[model samples]
Target: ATTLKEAADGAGRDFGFALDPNRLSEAQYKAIADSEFNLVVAENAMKWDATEPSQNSFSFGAGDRVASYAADTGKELYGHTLVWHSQLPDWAKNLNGSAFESAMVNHVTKVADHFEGKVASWDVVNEAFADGGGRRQDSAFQQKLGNGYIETAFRAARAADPTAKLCINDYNVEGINAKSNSLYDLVKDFKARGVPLDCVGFQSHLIVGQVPGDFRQNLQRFADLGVDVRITELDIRMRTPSDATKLATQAADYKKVVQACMQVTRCQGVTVWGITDKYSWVPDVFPGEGAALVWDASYAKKPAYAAVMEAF
Candidate 1:
């Protein structure tokens, strides 16, 4: 069977996440730099709160430190997000419509410009669609900029750095759910209207036995639009640590997720949120769950890791 490293190598690139900046010691960072993954995503490491906690005054000290590490290591960096409704600083939440739009544009411009050609891609607008057809009404951006915020963000990103690939990323779009359907319709409409969207990021944050039944069809539908697709933030969680039977089931789901990507021409890459179960954010964020990665904390390969490698 192929290994996770082999699968990602065959697939052009692999994406990994970084959470605690300090977790990557100098030696560990160097090891990752030489790994098979060409693409690396900073978990909450590069988000707005982590990058800029205060208003007007910008601070890239933390994120910039990470970016510098990635650059020195020769790894292609991918920014987590430019604008998301979550993890916003207090200053951003209180802005009015016009002010909020300005803030959005300024933030994107600054971040994109700062990184410039160093970063390869970015999650430009994350989770902006509701289940139905239209922008997520309750999100701060949607509430302020109305439904046109997506287009605006894309345009601003392009203006900031035309070289970087800007993408719309979200979870629940790995299969034919209402949110994915809405994104499909929206992408179609965006293309027809001459919007500047280049890719769709399907955050495959899945459950162990609940792999989407129509995963292949869902990917094809998006590929038909001529945009690239990426399996971002992929993970399979169980109610608790996996036993022998549970591991088998988890392996099947991992293979299925990988197979879905291999079958689609536009599907270019896959990224597990973290390298191991120890640092996985699932348990902390979800509770009563762990073992959601291809490797355990000891860095031993899990069944899903081998399964994904074989599928590729």
Candidate 2:
């Protein structure tokens, strides 16, 4: 059987983990740096509300610290996002119509320009499609920009930094569901129109036993479009702690996920949201759930971790 270190090295040149700058201590940071992962994703650390809580003011101290750590450790940094509907600054929420578009453009351009070439990839637009069909009408950008915001955001990001790889990222897209199909159509349209898209990010926040049946084929379809695909934000959740049955099932699920990625050439990497269960946001966000990661609170490798390594 292979180890976690070997699995990561065999998968791809890049691998990632979502990071919270506020929560990481220096020792913790070093531990992550020394892990098998070679990439770092700043979770909400670089969001508009987190970086620019108020108008005309910006803060990069926290994000900068994380970036510096990654750079020193030779790990590539990925900018979480620039234009998502969630966690908008209060000032932005007050705008409407053209005013809102202007604010969004300004925010995207400024953030993209600020990071520029430092980040390996940027999620230019995130979760802009409704689970049913068509654009997400409830999203502020959709409401204000009338579905054109997606293209506009990509254009602005490209203009800001031509070097960084731009991507459209979303969750619940592991299978051929309505939302995932719609995103595929949008990506096809973007390609036809010559949009500066380099990759697609699937936030694989999955349930324990429910693996997307067409997961490999789904990724291959996107790869067929000649764009790279990444399994970003992966985690498997259960309602209870580690036990014999749960651990065994979780291990199989992890291996299946890795196998799916391995089968798709364009599937570039896989990033678990958190390294250890202790810091996972799932338990707090989705109560009554535990055992959502490859490591326990004490950083001991779990069965899932071993399975993943063996699969790779």
Candidate 3:
């Protein structure tokens, strides 16, 4: 059990990292990805924009690369997302009413069907709720399909791939705050009505030393609602030019997140957002923020990597 995947397996969990299809050929990248993790989540290959760039026209080249690598390496493939507002194509963004609903359902069904037996789980919908607790106003699905869009998407996914675990994923909902509260309500309602939901994905994108105090409790409550919980897309970002002090704190933060998941019985596993800082999205999304992963640019294991191993 020296590797992360082996350690996770010892704990009855899965350890995974997001894989960028473009880097699959890199010896270093593929080496770590194949040997270290038991699960592989497509970083951007499975998104709506990547899978369905044009109306009724589908592409699986990017996503297939990731899936193929995962299979070849004996790693589980986790579908990133089926419905999302960002990274959406113009065709999907412009549709309205029944046409939009039809498009949305069709997209989910086709994609799910494409990877039916291959994907172990899926983020059926992602970032559907706004930060403050209400449904996002900017999401085209929410705008056209109304509050029922989430349910529709989940149902379609289930029908297409009954074996895959269907989940709803979002960021900034790791704590018991307004945003998470709204999600809690949704989970409760979904459970009560049998929404075909099987898991709740907490995209644990955190700042250094900022792990939520109630993080474990928040995950417990959702698990209590009869769905497995997962630490999806985990990464602790910090200010650039990281020193020993910052790296130490980052280690502790990573420990806290894995510990929280470990304490929750229904918490299935953890998936790092990316394999290395060089591939992290933090630097581009948040200026002055980077070094968010366990591996550095030179493929060196940082302190956070050791701490995560200790936690497992």
Candidate 4:
């Protein structure tokens, strides 16, 4: 009961971090991640691009390593992203009609079947919702397969791995925005139709001090739809030249997020985007902004780490 897993387990939720197997070469990365966290998610290893780059040619080299690491370390493995709009290979994007649906089902079946017993849950369809209360029009899935593609993906995942929980994951749905509400209605529809959805994941990627005041309210509404909620991909990126005040503010923000999840009965767990700032996707993706994670570049625990632990 001395670890963060112990802390979260006692508090009735699980704590996890997104990891890249490429970073395991950094000795400190594995040491701290294994010591402090109870669950893990692959950053890009399990994506469609990585799994099946060519037609019907399946590969799990990177993802298999992640699943193996999680198994060996006794950490819960959350398989990420079976179907997504972006990061798709050419063969998938070029397909149309029953061909596309067949390809999609085959990919899901093989990927889900490969990791069947290893992964506890999966983001069956990721980022499929668009803003302004509608499905993404530009996506090949919606264009070819229509809105039913989401349900189709979830069904395929369920059939391939009955024991593993299936989740629909998205970003920018942390609050009661138009997008979150639309997703809420989508879940209600799925539930009414008896879709095999078991959870909803809100990728809580944020900037400093802007933790949605209504974040908990949104989670509660989704939970009301009879699906458990999870705060996935959490990290608050701040402008560089961080000082005591910014770090303190980051601490409070992390604490707020954790507390929000703790307050909800069906809010299952939380997963930070990554363990440390060294390999964080933020600075590279955002430019001129860094220091987003709870651990610093030198692998030292920042104030936000303590804030999160206390929140749990």
Candidate 5:
């Protein structure tokens, strides 16, 4: 059990990473990706902007490449998203009323239909809840259809791909904060109503030393609602110029995350946001924050890698 996948297998869990299919040409990148992870998710290939850039027209070139790699490597594929406020084409963003609802369902239906049985699950709705614990106002779906849009997306996904589990994914919901509390209420109500929801994804994008003490509890509470919970899009970032001391702390933080998931019965697994620091979105998005994955820029296994393996 030298690899992360092997260790995860031993623990009856899945270990995954966000993959940039374009990097498959790099020998080291492909080698590690194929060998280390049991699951792979597209970083952006499956997003609305990339999949269906224009009205009604669709593309699967990039998404298919990712699916093919997962199949070739005997890894499970997780669809990144079906409906999101970001990365949406202008046509989708501008729609209102029934047109907006129709487009939303259509997008989910087509995407799920195209990848039916290929993906084990999907983030049916992503980032629909804002940091303030209320429905986000920015998305066309919310503006036009309100909170009902989330249920519509989930229902559409289930019908399109009955076998694939449907999940609502969000950031800053790793702990029982306002956003997560809002998610909890949604999940509970959906479970009671039988809304075809199957899972909740905590996009555990955290800073080093900031892993919540109640992270495991938060996951368990969601699982108790009869839906699986997953640590989706995980990455612990730190200030720039990582040193040995910082790496050690990052390693410990990684272990805590793994341990948290392992403790929860319905906690499905953990997925790092990226394969390596070289491709991490942290530095770009969070300025001065970098070195967020288990592999360093040179493809060497960082201490975080060993920590993750040990936890599993």
Candidate 6:
């Protein structure tokens, strides 16, 4: 059988996963990740809480291990994020006014610089919008810099590593809706101002039967704006003890996502949030709803995996 990466290459795309390094001890996880994925985005090790657990103090142990492993294994690394409201430590959260601006700049600069040559790209700013269609004012970064904080972060990241591709990643943008409209405006404005942006990441976290009606059209719109797109955090969750029907529905859903990417030239690649249901983040985040990945809890292939392979 052809591996996921090989199939993706045959279909003219790249395949990847979100690395949960703690699962590396499982030989099954290591074997598949080492061979099947050409790219990886650390699920949490690179987040603010894990990287800068304290004020002015940085920890690269966990994050570095993922980066090093990716390097050794020939898998390209994509920085999970540089700025996010969640996963921020007290120091980053406590600041206000001009102080907060400096803090964000410093943190992004340090992190990007440290991992300069180790990554191919970064989610420079992640999930900066509110639920419907507006900027999130609650974040310290937004409170201090307003919407300009995003441009500032991108500039700082660029200064740290010009070669690294920069992206603004968010969820609920798989369809042409309010939240995605806001992001399109942001990217358009940034492009008009000559801001250095390379891509947009759609965190395609969807329910089993709720895949968007116009997913491919949505991706095409973003690609038309001249920035590449990627299905960054794809997963179709379902109730536990999913029946064969639900599993079949999930296979169709996964096919929709993969085919949507393939229909758009600028949709660069696809990366499921995790490799298998055994350690998926769905159950913890969404009570009673689990099994959001392409692999079963036992490391066996799910129908969704073949759907993705065939779609590619």
TM-score of each: 0.93, 0.95, 0.99, 0.97, 0.98, 0.98
lDDT string for model 1 (145-195, tens) is 888888898999899998888889998878887789889988898888888
Candidate with the larger lDDT of 2 and 6:
6
CA shift of 5, model 6, Å: 1.2
Worst 10 residues of 4 by lDDT: 1-10
lDDT of 4 by residue, 130-167 (tens): 87667887788999998788989999999999989899
lDDT of 3 by residue, 9-88 (tens): 89988899999988877899988987789989999999999999999999999999888988888888899999999999
TM-score of 6: 0.98
From the highest lDDT down, the ranking of the candidates is 3, 5, 4, 6, 2, 1
Worst 10 residues of 6 by lDDT: 136-145
What is candidate 6's CA lDDT for residue 40? 89
Candidate 6 or 3, higher TM-score: 3
Estimate candidate 1's alpha-carbon lDDT, on a 0 to 1 scale.
Answer: 0.80
lDDT of each: 0.80, 0.83, 0.92, 0.91, 0.92, 0.90
RMSD (Å) per prediction: 2.1, 1.7, 0.8, 1.2, 0.8, 1.1
Better of 3 and 4 by lDDT: 3
Give the runs in model 4 whose Cα sits over 4 Å from its true position. Answer: none
Candidate 5 lDDT by residue in tens digits, 32-105: 98889999999999999998889899999999999999998899899999988889899887888998888888
State the TM-score for model 5.
0.98
